[PDB]
Symmetry: D2
Subunit: 419 residues, 4 copies
């Protein structure tokens, strides 16, 4: 069991080049199951979930290889199932269902169980596919979708704003018979990116980025080349790294308009921010951050994927900060760990009341989930002494060589084994 | 203290002509304060809040008169305060602050207190105005806004989706210097309608209806004519009226695209729905409704203003219905009253678990707020016997002579005094 | 519509003699319906609810008269129903059901509708009576109970801790055949007082004050004399009055052991407290209170009836105070009103985050419920200038001559009309 | 990674002998650190946490050994710290802090991090120890307690009911100077058992079992023998086993009065229950269970440790069952897993709405915590086909060879490896 040994404090400054978005690459890779012709996806980060995805696709009969790009040839998909073994390691596997039933009339994916940050049901994915004409049956833990011929467009109103269900329904609808409308669709940048990818293959989609998406089905989708957009969560993570360590940083290969909420909050924390077409610079001028109030919600509001990072920022900020999480019911696992490092906080239902302290103390902590692990590593960077973050494999799920990029910013970090 | 005597059951059927939206006419009436020339607002419903608004505007030195339209001449606005006496009867008065400070550099409005359905703070309106350059102070219960010269455009990210704050900021921004961007803005049809009204006066606005509104300030706004859009909640209320009484109805002067969530839910309840350019028909074919699941949220999701009405529908429906209110913290006051009529429900935090019964029993109940009073009246129409709904003055706030429109559908309803 | 016009600031100091507990007097007065012989209840406060109760009792055929005591003669009961008109003014009327069905085999009470501070169902009262053998029906909004002969003892486990339901079940059980056991009973001081009252009439009760109450039914209860214990909420209210005005007070005719949580919280706020056998003294030594954290819960935890008062204390205290209400879902109505007076707070689900300020500003505010009204009045006492608390009739429901007692502490208060 | 392969459906019937309470043995074993003379604890179950506890004690310089009993000689404790590597595997280790600082004036325990079912802070333990005079510092993740001389009795009011904090405070108070009073103490049967154990060593404690515990400190505690009470949760687990499989079972070595809430709920589910002095019999007479409503809360209310089990019972019961969890914020992890087996449920905040189905389908599921793992195993016993419960090491924490006991009841179970 790998761990990260961090010695602080250290001001983090310099530059970092943002990788392609984990959450755009994933839905795109699955959307590729719709392509009857070779597809090249560019700027795909090297993450654990990308590997698991390539594995799942290959197991479906797809020809896959990668480097900076991932080349896909799904012309001969001949297997339509995602076994429990793979699904249990990556719930995103659920995104295989829509494309498979939409193009081949069938698909079986193991129903994901519970997740670290919440129950995370997939009822909206199922609801959507059923509205498109698919028949869904659950047997032996497998959601089994089927349709005789082509799915049929339908006007669907979402009971909840869901990034995942939006991707599933929008993706399957591209090969449906007629027009599909997704009312109360997720507006996240990754939805836009996945939509534009599908359109690149020959799909007809409009409204991506708004509350209502309109898809006009076609008989088939071809191939092509598409470059994934910048990872806004990675970008925010590094901006937070500078913001909490009195440093300065410039993020290259970034897309500023995907982060208005985060940037505005960073400015309120006292950060001096400047943005360009493809870059963002943040300078704390050696100042300690000011406490801010945050409420997560669907894009363009403050993103839940930056919540643990801002929880850390408030814990070392001057003043009382309040963090309200409205997306996932169990996403405060980093709090108890930060408390071990000397932080002061109280959890009241889905809100964390933070009382910032001058400095944290190095201690042994445990990563419980992707964003939580990144926060613990950042905490280790600014804490006094040695911090050992156990189970950092979590971090390898959504950050490409975070270790090197942090070191390049002045961090004293070492990856160690010792199970 | 007026009351409503309703005798049932009665299958409600026929037609109704939807009035102009209460929640579009109000923000527009206040936005009119920005007009330097005569303005005519058409299709304005005759509601208690419209009367209070006319008095408030008059008290600001505005010349006001009405019938179907409301004619406004705010060329000579010479007073800039909204007193506690008026604000305490209508919190919407808060909408006078932005236009006043934007056009005259000053404005004072009594800070609204607690509301029946929630604390409903206005911190976001104040925040927005401050971001536009206004200096805000609270003294003696009055929020006093001021700015030296014109307000200045700014990029504002909303910590919460707010219909009211969106109106305040968007309205004030039309006269600000430069460009204003509202990130995570409310998307309600009434926001769209208010934006279009401001545009008709000469304002420059785009993005209304999406989560990002862009306003380019101008030196001043003129006058003109604008017709308020159909009231979607009144429409939904009457559609429910037929849906729960096994009836049929046709709503005239309606705008179907403002009710996708509501219509979708009525179909799930078993309703046969048809829509035209400006009309909506619903036929229950004598059926008892089927229990549905609802979760209120910002437009285009299911609206909180239809929540009590659907709570009623589920309480007389087949099966177990679940209603989750995420907008207001005290909007279940109709439940205890419906329970007095034989309904079976349990409140669990912000969710109501409903167990539909065949028929309700007439009983004496108390209206506590606008939408709940409408639900109790509808309940009276379908319950067995006589139902007396006390304090129906609440209903005259958002419905234009509802007993008449209901009587034309076959309701045995009478307005009595007896304090 | 009476109001309290209060001039501040004024330090509150001196002495106050605590009246009998409103919440002990009420359940005992209803318990008296079980008495076949004359009963005298001493130390009964003069409150609106006592008058409504004496009114309801008289209406049942009981002979009632009062002064310091209330003399009851229920040897004859010629009517067994509590009308809607009365119940609507006092939900506590529900307590007439149990004694009536237990002694006469019949009784009916109008099902209470919604309450200002919550839905407050009475399902547990009904459940308990049904477990004791009563048949319950709901017709025309009335709860109708009946039993052929005597009720029979049962082992009942309460799904939730309820003061009211514990009173109903314990009271009815006294005339039941056999032994009754109430598991997970409320342990409030008033339950202990009502049990001791019943025992004085000849009932056999043990465990009152613990989570399991054992009642041994007897054929009939006689008469007697019983003194109601001191009102702990009135006591806490006056202690807070001193704590938030830098004052020093001595509460006479008090019972310290019923207020451990409150006293401990006041000490944490910086109050110097001393207690005797029947008195409590509190001295703030001119200090501003220190913010505290509070979580309401069943006795002996911090009581929800002191929640609004402590919210006020935190809003004028030094630091960040947190109030969490777990009993009633709508008991923060005082917050929006205090905010009108310059307080700073945010409500997050069932928790209020307070940011204490130096001085409040006098303003026009509205009382919404009993404890809230008392808090607004205290706020007026320490605020700068003139505060007008509308609808103070709410305060006359549970405070005997609060105006006089406050004036005797130095308050500049005046009860004015002017509707 | 061990797993359980279960084959269903198999009716569970027969007998089981209840082991000593896991949650009584643990606090007692730590309380033993106060004993200056040899102690023998009887009826201690063989569980993972007991082993970890013996390791921790041993490492403090304690002489420990076991079989049915555990013999402790803590006369020579020479080390006062519980390392991170031990506490990370068992947060109950926190219970070493109080005894150590109370008897030796010092002690340091690694502050526990996050837990599977919630953040579970220990702020109340620290608060209590500080009130007893201990100085608490946090450094490098270790909570360091110290006091010069002996702790001093104090009147402590818990602003939340905590089993753990109650144990910590009550344990340390036994050696304190003077009288300590714990207001709003936990009333769990294990608190009673731990208090009687301390009393057996020479401590002076009264009130155990009520919301107020009084402890009179003494100079030192001797040795002795004490038998741990029956495990009510294990008992409840096996009673549910029979109740959901239409079986009949008898639990030996049980203590009925510790399960009033659970038995009452089982009867409501249709179970025929009889109890003796030390046994409990439950017969379902081949009937399918009836859906019940549950709300966890401090003893004697329904226990949170039986919540997952009852979630299961409702998922295979007739009707709609509602489970509300008020103790831990993340204890619904079993729901997603049961859903994979064909169950129908929706999670609404802290409530689960269940829609019972006839039969579950065997599938691969994952144990997430102790009670959840037991629930999944039981589900496997009644499900149709093969069920594989991964990570059953969780079950070995609180159940002594559950495999054998279930098999003795007719279950087709087998522990397999295969990582
Ligand atoms: C957790 C991460 O990323 C997450 C990110 O937090 C969320 C929210 O923006 O959207 C993606 O998941 P997701 O698709 O499961 O998110 P959502 O579907 O939007 O879930 C939002 C809310 O809806 C609920 N939900 C979702 C689907 C459904 O059928 N039913 C349902 O009730 C969720 O359980 C939650 O209560 C990202 N993952 C990918 C692979 O695209 C991370 O990388 O750190
Ligand atoms: C209640 C009615 O209508 C309401 C309707 O329910 C709501 C929601 O769609 O939007 C209008 O009020 P509103 O402007 O106060 O609504 P919002 O601002 O959107 O409030 C939404 C949520 O944000 C909160 N909120 C709002 C403003 C602010 O500064 N801060 C804040 O925290 C609210 O208290 C609530 O928790 C309608 N009223 C008018 C006059 O336009 C009705 O007619 O029955
Ligand atoms: C509100 C006041 O006093 C109240 C005090 O707050 C509460 C709590 O201690 O106990 C008395 O009411 P109560 O009898 O209605 O209180 P409870 O029954 O204990 O209610 C507690 C919780 O249980 C719920 N509840 C109660 C009864 C029932 O059948 N079902 C149920 O769900 C409540 O709605 C609430 O969510 C006092 N009133 C009298 C007349 O004795 C006041 O005087 O200011
Ligand atoms: C989880 C198990 O058992 C648990 C059982 O659920 C709970 C509740 O009855 O009481 C014991 O834990 P515990 O001591 O941590 O329980 P509690 O202290 O009572 O916690 C109750 C509530 O108070 C909170 N809490 C507790 C202590 C504190 O200092 N602060 C605090 O906020 C908790 O996080 C929770 O929100 C049992 N464990 C042992 C080893 O005795 C199990 O065996 O499955």
């Amino acid at each position: 069991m790998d761990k990260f040994r961090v010695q602080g404090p250290t001001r983090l400054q310099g530059e970092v080049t943002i990788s392609g978005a984990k959450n755009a690459a994933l839905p795109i890779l699955f959307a590729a199951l719709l392509a009857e012709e070779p597809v090249e996806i560019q700027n795909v980060p090297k993450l654990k979930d990308i590997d698991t995805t390539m594995k799942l696709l290959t197991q479906l009969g797809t020809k896959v290889e990668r480097x900076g790009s991932v080349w896909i040839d799904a012309s001969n998909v001949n297997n339509f199932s995602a076994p429990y073994d793979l699904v249990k390691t990556m719930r995103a596997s659920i995104w295989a269902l829509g494309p498979l039933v939409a193009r081949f009339g069938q698909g079986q994916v193991s129903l994901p169980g519970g997740s670290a940050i919440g129950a995370r049901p997939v009822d909206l994915h199922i609801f959507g596919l059923e509205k498109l004409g698919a028949e869904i049956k659950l047997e032996e833990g497998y959601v089994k979708a089927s349709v005789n011929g082509r799915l049929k467009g339908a006007h669907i109103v979402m009971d909840k704003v869901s990034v995942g269900a939006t991707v599933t329904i929008m993706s399957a609808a591209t090969l449906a018979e007629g027009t599909t409308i997704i009312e109360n669709a997720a507006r996240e940048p990754e939805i836009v990116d996945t939509a534009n990818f599908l359109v690149a293959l020959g799909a007809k989609i409009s409204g991506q980025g708004t509350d209502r998406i309109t898809i006009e089905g076609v008989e088939r989708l071809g191939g092509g080349v598409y470059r994934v957009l910048p990872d806004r969560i990675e970008t925010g993570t590094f901006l937070v790294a500078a913001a909490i360590s009195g440093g300065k940083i410039v993020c290259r290969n970034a897309q500023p308009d995907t982060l208005d909420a985060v940037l505005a909050k960073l400015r309120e924390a006292g950060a001096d921010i400047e943005t360009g077409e493809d870059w963002i610079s943040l300078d704390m001028h050696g100042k300690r951050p000011k406490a801010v109030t945050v409420r997560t919600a669907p894009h363009p509001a403050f993103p839940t994927d930056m919540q643990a990072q801002f929880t850390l920022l408030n814990l070392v900020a001057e003043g009382t900060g309040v963090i309200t999480e409205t997306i996932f019911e169990n996403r405060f696992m980093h709090v108890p760990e930060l408390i071990r490092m000397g932080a002061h906080a109280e959890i009241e239902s889905n809100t964390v009341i933070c009382h910032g302290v001058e400095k944290l103390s190095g201690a042994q902590v445990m990563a419980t989930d992707l964003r939580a692990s990144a926060s613990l590593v950042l905490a280790g960077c600014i804490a006094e002494g040695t911090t050992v973050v156990d189970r950092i494999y979590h971090i390898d799920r959504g950050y490409e060589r975070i270790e090197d990029k942090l070191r390049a910013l002045g961090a004293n970090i070492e990856r160690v084994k010792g199970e």
